[PDB]
Amino acid sequence: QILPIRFQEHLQLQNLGINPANIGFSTLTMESDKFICIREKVGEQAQVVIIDMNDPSNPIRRPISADSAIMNPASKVIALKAGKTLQIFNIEMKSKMKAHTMTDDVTFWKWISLNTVALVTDNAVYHWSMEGESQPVKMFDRHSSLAGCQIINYRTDAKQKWLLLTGISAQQNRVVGAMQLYSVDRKVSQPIEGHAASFAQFKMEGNAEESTLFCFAVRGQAGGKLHIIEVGTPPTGNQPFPKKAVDVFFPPEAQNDFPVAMQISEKHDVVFLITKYGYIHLYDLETGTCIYMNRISGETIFVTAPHEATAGIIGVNRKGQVLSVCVEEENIIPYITNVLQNPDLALRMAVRNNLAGAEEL
């Protein structure tokens, strides 16, 4: 049978000498699809294992004194932190690029662009750009609802004027996500119950310029729900994006699941959603319509990234399989019109994203 998405296996890290207690959210980071960095405990010389994804047979192992190591999303430039000490290193030049010591402990950090690491302490969120002697500037202060939570994500939009911090707490058999959405233009935040999110740029039809869309999924309490909403005032000449709110189905076998990860393709205008028990969901970004729903992994996929070559999502599970799911481009429109029995959505995604299969009217 002809399916709307395509699966690929890239690596299994256990074949390169990675012990799976170090395959986890604490010790493995994958900021983009170019590199994987594994904090490793061998003997007790604490080392880091850096996998080039364009050369996976030759990883490099170097000793560290850091509690977290994140790779730059484009270059082989590592960021290492110990408590309040932060350092930025070029690996191919063996040079320290930058260094800064904060007043507080940085509990979470993530590259948000090509040259900016974002820094999360217990009370504030900082943006540290790598240009020159640029020191971390403060974006916003943290909200009451994210205190005492495990911070799992921080995502911005492309203009970096809409920021979102995402943490989780354990409230009675159930992982409750708390998100702080902050705008730097109105200097105001909002607490949202939310589990996984991403931002997107989306030019509507009949329209001059792109909407900036905020998409998040929650297993809140009514159930699983997915919301797609425009943030900010629309530009002038731009009709506003109509608010989308659809259901996220969870099966009765997996009624302790919740979403953990989200990437949005802009080549196809779709939303990839992965849950904790290893389920992939594919939605349409314009309408919210569920295209596909099935289970990619037996184990927990804890880290994801955009897949740039296929316009998809790449993720690592707890066993160590590096997997990728993308839109199968010659199959998705015949899947929507005949298996999903939706000729209208198949017509719309064939005109909007230049997909084949628009000769069956």
Binding site: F89, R142, S183
Partner: peptide
């Protein structure tokens, strides 16, 4: 400051309305 590698409270308002 030795190298970490060896190579050798806010304003709350409504930004978005989520009620359909």
């Amino acid at each position: 400051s030795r190298p970490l590698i060896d190579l050798m409270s806010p304003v709350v308002g409504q930004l978005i309305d989520l009620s359909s």
